[PDB]
Design a binder for this molecule. Structure first.
Ligand code: HEM
Ligand code: HEM
Ligand code: HEM
Ligand code: HEM
Ligand code: HEM
Ligand code: HEM
Ligand code: HEM
Ligand code: HEM
Ligand code: HEM
Ligand code: HEM
Ligand code: HEM
Lengths: 142, 140, 145, 146, 146, 140, 146, 145, 142, 140, 140
């Protein structure tokens, strides 16, 4: 799915949860802590950015690069031609890195849980968030 | 019933409780809300003045006419001949409305309910006698 | 607007200062009688039209005066809620349609007698706001009369 | 010059007010205008962007490049309240630009002009003075090495 | 007993709220009730008031006497915040009552009862305890000597 | 008199009006101040507990014992057998105190005077029935 | 009629103040009185409740039925601030009542009267006008279909 | 009342969060188009009744959608002043009396399409307050239709 | 156990944590999120009320029906004859639905954890809550 | 005239200045008050919508319809084909109203007068171009 | 251009907007910040007065000299011969500074941008005419 109305909703709630300044680090910590707890083998994928210490400056910069890329895709959800080009470039930064296919549904689940935790669960549209996040990661994975 | 001293006390506490401007309208709606809560059968008696919506202009206007009459009667509590004439006028108006003693007793209890909640001081003895004085003149 | 919220609020404040239940019944009768005196002279309406015949010593006429000034009091204190006040004036209007001899001019005279007596007992009264608000009250009571 | 605490608070607020993902059809217009100004002031610089279809600015390819570059600035601008993380990110950006043949430090001076031209036209409240100092704090971190 | 600062502030406020010259047809009703209670509790005391037509209570003569006596209390009650002046006034009232054959100190005890009976019926808020102590402070000043 | 629904309302309004800590003491003194204002002959009945000074510790303690008893009776209004036993105990205590019906009627009017002045909502109908229920059990 | 934002805030507060699980020996008294009033106004309706021992009102069976019905109202009343959830719940309640032979829409009109009779006697502060409109908003959702 | 001040205030707040001039024109068109899609299916009204024929790629229909949602926006933001809002709805009512094919049922369908789409883009919407206020707006626009 | 004093304590703390209005949904989310994390096969039992999306209107209504039933039992803890009848009816709504016996101790643990989280852990009486919750579910299960 | 960057700035400042709810009505009356203060001959053009009393519901409704149209045009400033179609629709409506260039120039100056008094930041260059863009489309 | 009535209005709104003490300095920096935002090519014209740092004492002093001149010109708006002489003096000073019409038009738009953001009331018609009056005298 991820309808035109869905994309407006996800854009609004993402900007709210992502936020400004150091609030972005608050959202990232929620994502990586959840992801590494659910999928502990994912931490080793980030050994070059010091995934053993997510509070380090090295990993926080990596985290904000990732969330920055997700923000960049979210903001372009209503601009599909540009989105497809953004995803194609992101794919080139992930291919043949040995990233397991399971990492992407796991990341989606952790990102949705963290946004849900930040903006509040009541009336949270999981169908809109899952379907639109799935359009993003299916362009990056594989 | 309701002597010259009690009249002053009741006139003083009424004017302070009844208030001014929109506070009279809120007071008057609360009075009839308590009446309906105390005697549910009384609500239907007011079907001709929009009792279906108690915040309506029509029902608020009826509540003000009633408390305004109470207001003018309490104002003349100390002029026995004037209030006797006015109470007789009100009795003639209420004679055809199929009211009984419990209707006025419920109204009295409603008055004893809402008036002191707008007061720091309230003498229910004086109010009991002076309300009885007024209602007895209207009940016929 | 005519009788604005500001106009209504000062009229209400001044009226209730001059006229409220804590005052003696004799004082309120003295004001209502004075209002009816001015009304009789400005309007030419026959005092025999009223119970007690205008005699200030008759308890029937003092009670009639109390009823009329009370109706004005109820409308005055409702001037900040036009919807409620319109309903009050409409009720009064219908009551006076059923009275032979009540004209729109006479209703205006009585409402003006109210303002003039108020400014006699309260010389600092906002007589413009009083004229505008009593004219609104008079127009509603005397609609079609 | 120094990007002060007051400078970065003002810049971050006014940047995020224009660049927020909550809005639509702003990022491309802004980012396209930036590179259009860059190419207007340094027509030779367009040759560096031949892998992203710079000769077809309304292509999805070039629009995505513009958005990608300027969102890189958004990421860095919002790191201004955690400069330890910002330093890591600027080093990361520096190493990527060092591996791009032809990217010189003077190019970032032209990029500063392009943002200095575009931002006053788009941001309701804009303090060019605070923007100049805080863009320099970021651009000097990237352009170090080249 | 002592008429405290709090006592006299409460009494003065509640007295003036009932006795104020701004109202009509209260003073006579109150003052008449006071002497009606006085005569009810000490029927012999009525003989002291033969010069003011005590046997015709609704006469202008007796109504004016009642108002005159009780307004004397109003004057003294409102002096409670200037006791140096109150002492002069009570001495003045004492000398007038000393020159009245038959006026005894025990009569003021009966007068206290009459006010203690009338005031709770007429004053919206009434603290009998504060009233008792501050009436005594005034009445003892008048009744001194007799 | 005083049904299960009215008991809940009275228990709710009493607990809110009576309050806690020193507010109970101020409430209790106000109750007896209103009693004395309504029936002056009742004041002398309390000469054994320092009624000469109503702010004294001795008279405040008596006022609290009385309202505390009212408090414990209202608490058990919904346990008919418990309050009946307690009211019988109170009746036996009051039997020797030379009290009459007007004393309890004045007390009732005092209760109806002070309770609503500490409330935004007050149902005098329910209070009239439930006070009658309590006082009738004590008056013998 | 419309159950306004102000209506449901007033109703929810005054309902929960009486129905809260924190208190004891209120729910049964209230719920029993509701059905006692229902049977008083529609004696035929008692036949619908033969599976819950309606002819023995003080049985645990019937007391539990009353509490079960009225707590169903508590669940719906507290959904008034999430009407999307309330609509699902009323549909759920409607389908259960549609499967009960004899349950007609006019019965809910009699149930409204029973609550309108019971609640003013039990709730310290009670606005019948707000209650009528918000009970109708819930009862019309249940009674739809029958 | 129906659409009380409390109802109106939350509807206004939620609507302007979803719909305001700072948003992209494409985003507002996407919402208006979605509203018209729901309206077409619930009402059965022919899209050819509108300029552009309901084609979301036609600039004539997107401008027609902008005009209709703007009229609803102007009425929504006036919900706290009933006198002003009644005047706005009366003007809209007269404009639609002069259009062959505008029924009171269709007007209700479009106002309900507004509420349903709002709750899709803003799932926390107070859908009861939305129903009450859009029904007030619909009743005024479709008076006599 | 679940003594007469225990029942007063549980009643007070339950009403506090359960609360009014949408606060009830806050408590439910705590319960179902904990239950489904500890016992993931329990989610499929709720496929008819959309247990895959606990934030949906369908599941929230179901959640508030359950919490409503628990509230109804909690409030009747000092009224044992009525409680026994309430539990008997609840049993009829759960029997032969194929609900595993393990779901009830799991639900009890999740409900206690959520109430504890809402009213605060300090001095929280776990013996009173476990024993009184066990009286409730032992009437429903089996 | 009025480029993609200026459109964003104008849309941002308009939404903030125009506001919500009754603030729109006060804004809209102020706009026409400034129009009448700048070009007195324009007031008579609005005799059909109760301009005799600018606080009337009728004239407030007209002021909102006008600013609401401005609001919907600014909203579509970034969708060139949509606003061009809408401006053509407005031009056809205004063609019969006997308006001239000074009427729209006065309106522009009124807009430049009221909008910045509800703003901390205002770019009159961008507003001059973008207002010209809108008004030129309506003036024919 | 700029009649005796408009002069009073502009003098009134200028004095209120320009303010006193440090508020003049903040106002003056904001004016040139808007100028630079509107016409970026104008910033380099001020390289001789520390425009590299707009909060510097040197650039603040230049901004005050400019707004102070605007202040003294508006003060003499109603003395035609005095301001004509002063504007001629300013024109002679600006003749060598390589300025064009767009520079003064951008300055005007900057003035129309910052002045109303410090005002509850602003008449852009009067300001347009009176600014044109001033700038035309300086532009030569
Ligand atoms: C929407 C989802 C995602 C987005 C937008 C995203 C985006 C990014 C971005 C922008 C970078 C920075 C590359 C650079 O400039 O150096 C990055 C790095 C990386 N990401 Fe992703 N990513 C996503 C999901 C994932 C997932 C699910 C995994 C693994 C389970 C993953 C693994 C990595 C790794 C290993 C790196 C490189 C770390 C390094 O610098 O050594 N990403 N990603
Ligand atoms: C106790 C003091 C009362 C006073 C001072 C009073 C006074 C009034 C007044 C002034 C009116 C206005 C008549 C008119 O202008 O047309 C009225 C009408 C009415 N009153 Fe009373 N009243 C009292 C008691 C009651 C009670 C206890 C009831 C019923 C329980 C009652 C029922 C009515 C009814 C039914 C009307 C007419 C409503 C209609 O027009 O449909 N009144 N009353
Ligand atoms: C501000 C102007 C007026 C007000 C507020 C007013 C109001 C009232 C009210 C409240 C009553 C008593 C209603 C009742 O008996 O329940 C009344 C009765 C009456 N009014 Fe008016 N009135 C006004 C002017 C007039 C005028 C100008 C006339 C004659 C020219 C008039 C003639 C009468 C008469 C004769 C009655 C007695 C009706 C009866 O005894 O049944 N009124 N009016
Ligand atoms: C603050 C200033 C700048 C920032 C934040 C920035 C950031 C970025 C980012 C995020 C990318 C994305 C490509 C990737 O990482 O895979 C990129 C690519 C690139 N940048 Fe920069 N950049 C800046 C200035 C410049 C300048 C001034 C130049 C040259 C004049 C330049 C030349 C390039 C080139 C050639 C690419 C690669 C294009 C391609 O993908 O083929 N950058 N930059
Ligand atoms: C607080 C208590 C009292 C106050 C303030 C008070 C004050 C007054 C005043 C002001 C007068 C006016 C006469 C004048 O001064 O020319 C008066 C007269 C008088 N008082 Fe008192 N008095 C009090 C108590 C009493 C009592 C208890 C008695 C005797 C039982 C009494 C006996 C008289 C008499 C006989 C007169 C003269 C009556 C006459 O004019 O023929 N007074 N008093
Ligand atoms: C209506 C509810 C009443 C309640 C609940 C109540 C309760 C009590 C209680 C608890 C005591 C304390 C006995 C002790 O501890 O020694 C007491 C004492 C007393 N009560 Fe009552 N009572 C009530 C009514 C009345 C009334 C109406 C009167 C008189 C008008 C009255 C007169 C007394 C007296 C004289 C004492 C003894 C004072 C002493 O020790 O000298 N009571 N009452
Ligand atoms: C707001 C109004 C009402 C609500 C919230 C409500 C709710 C409920 C609830 C929660 C039950 C529990 C039984 C179950 O679900 O297993 C129930 C059962 C039932 N209700 Fe209602 N109800 C309402 C009105 C009515 C009315 C007016 C009638 C008929 C006059 C009615 C007839 C029944 C019957 C016959 C049962 C089944 C009794 C049994 O278990 O044998 N209900 N209702
Ligand atoms: C909430 C519901 C509605 C609102 C707020 C609304 C409002 C409006 C507005 C503001 C316009 C443009 C006025 C102008 O051109 O200046 C318009 C035009 C129009 N409306 Fe409605 N409307 C509504 C419902 C409907 C419905 C239900 C229909 C058809 C069944 C309809 C049919 C039309 C048509 C055909 C036009 C075009 C008229 C033209 O092009 O001149 N509208 N409406
Ligand atoms: C104290 C504990 C519990 C209480 C009070 C309770 C109560 C309820 C209630 C009132 C309903 C609504 C039935 C209806 O009206 O449709 C329900 C439904 C249901 N409950 Fe329970 N329940 C409890 C524990 C559990 C547990 C532990 C499970 C599974 C592990 C469970 C599984 C279900 C299912 C499957 C449904 C039906 C869902 C559907 O509508 O399709 N319950 N429960
Ligand atoms: C510049 C942007 C303008 C916009 C967006 C605009 C928009 C509108 C709108 C939406 C209406 C409502 C038509 C209806 O619903 O019946 C209207 C009516 C009208 N407008 Fe404009 N307008 C603008 C400029 C002007 C100017 C400059 C004038 C005159 C100086 C003017 C004079 C009128 C008149 C006379 C009416 C009709 C009033 C009546 O019905 O009696 N408009 N305009
Ligand atoms: C419109 C009203 C203007 C006024 C009242 C004004 C007034 C002044 C004044 C008083 C000075 C101070 C000269 C000194 O003390 O040395 C000055 C200097 C200057 N002004 Fe203007 N001016 C105006 C317009 C402009 C404009 C539009 C520009 C350029 C866009 C401009 C550019 C300059 C420059 C470059 C200087 C000299 C800076 C330096 O010393 O390096 N002026 N002006």
């Amino acid at each position: 799915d991820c309808t035109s109305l869905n994309r407006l909703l996800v854009k609004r709630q993402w900007a709210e949860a992502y936020g400004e300044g150091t609030n972005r680090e608050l959202l990232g910590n929620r994502i990586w802590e959840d992801l590494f707890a659910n999928m502990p083998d994912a931490r080793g994928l980030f050994s070059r950015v010091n995934g053993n210490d997510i509070d380090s400056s090295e990993f926080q910069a990596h985290s904000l690069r990732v969330l920055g890329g997700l923000d960049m895709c979210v903001a372009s959800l209503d601009d599909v031609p540009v989105l497809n080009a953004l995803l194609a470039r992101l794919n080139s930064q992930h291919d043949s890195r040995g990233i397991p296919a399971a990492g992407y549904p796991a990341f989606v689940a952790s990102a949705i849980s963290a946004v849900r935790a930040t903006v509040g669960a009541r009336s949270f549209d999981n169908d809109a968030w899952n379907s639109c996040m799935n359009q993003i990661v299916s362009g990056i994975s594989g | 019933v309701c002597n010259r001293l009690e009249q002053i006390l009741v006139k003083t506490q009424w004017a302070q409780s009844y208030g001014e401007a929109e506070n009279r309208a809120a007071f008057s709606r609360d009075l009839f809300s308590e009446l309906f809560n105390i005697q549910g059968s009384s609500r239907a008696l007011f079907s001709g003045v929009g009792v279906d919506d108690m915040n309506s202009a029509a029902f608020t206007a009826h509540c003000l006419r009633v408390t305004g009459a109470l207001n003018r009667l309490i104002s003349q509590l100390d002029q026995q001949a004037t209030i006797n004439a006015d109470l007789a006028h009100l009795a003639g108006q209420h004679a055809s409305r199929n009211l009984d003693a419990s209707n006025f007793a419920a109204m009295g209890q409603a008055v004893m309910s809402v008036v002191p909640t707008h007061l720091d001081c309230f003498n229910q003895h004086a109010w009991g006698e002076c309300y009885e004085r007024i209602a007895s003149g209207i009940s016929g | 607007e005519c009788c604005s919220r500001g106009d209504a609020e000062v009229v209400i404040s001044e009226w209730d200062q001059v006229f409220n239940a804590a005052m003696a019944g004799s004082s309120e009768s003295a004001i209502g009688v004075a209002i009816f005196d001015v009304f009789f002279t400005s309007s030419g309406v026959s005092p025999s039209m009223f119970p007690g015949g205008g005699d200030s010593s008759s308890a029937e006429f003092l009670a009639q005066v109390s009823r009329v000034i009370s109706g004005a009091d109820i409308a005055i204190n409702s001037l900040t809620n036009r919807a409620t006040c319109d309903s009050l004036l409409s009720h009064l209007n219908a009551q006076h349609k059923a009275i032979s001899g009540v004209t729109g001019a006479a209703v205006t005279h009585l409402s003006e007698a109210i303002s003039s007596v108020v400014a006699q007992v309260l010389p600092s009264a906002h007589i413009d706001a009083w004229g505008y608000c009593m004219a609104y009250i008079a127009a509603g009571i005397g609609a079609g009369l | 010059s120094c990007c002060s605490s007051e400078d970065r608070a003002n810049v971050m607020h006014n940047w995020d007010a224009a660049w927020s993902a909550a809005y639509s059809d702003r990022r491309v217009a802004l980012a396209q205008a930036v590179f259009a100004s860059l190419f207007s002031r340094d027509a030779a610089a367009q040759g560096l962007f031949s892998g992203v279809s710079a000769d077809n600015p309304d292509s999805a390819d070039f629009r995505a490049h513009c958005v990608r570059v300027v969102n890189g600035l958004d990421v860095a601008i919002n790191m201004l309240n955690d400069p330890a993380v910002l330093n890591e990110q600027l080093a990361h950006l520096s190493a990527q630009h060092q591996a791009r043949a032809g990217v010189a430090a003077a190019h970032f001076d032209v990029m500063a002009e392009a943002f200095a031209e575009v931002m006053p036209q788009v941001s309701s409240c804009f303090s060019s003075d605070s923007w100049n100092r805080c863009f320099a704090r970021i651009a000097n971190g990237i352009s170090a090495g080249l």
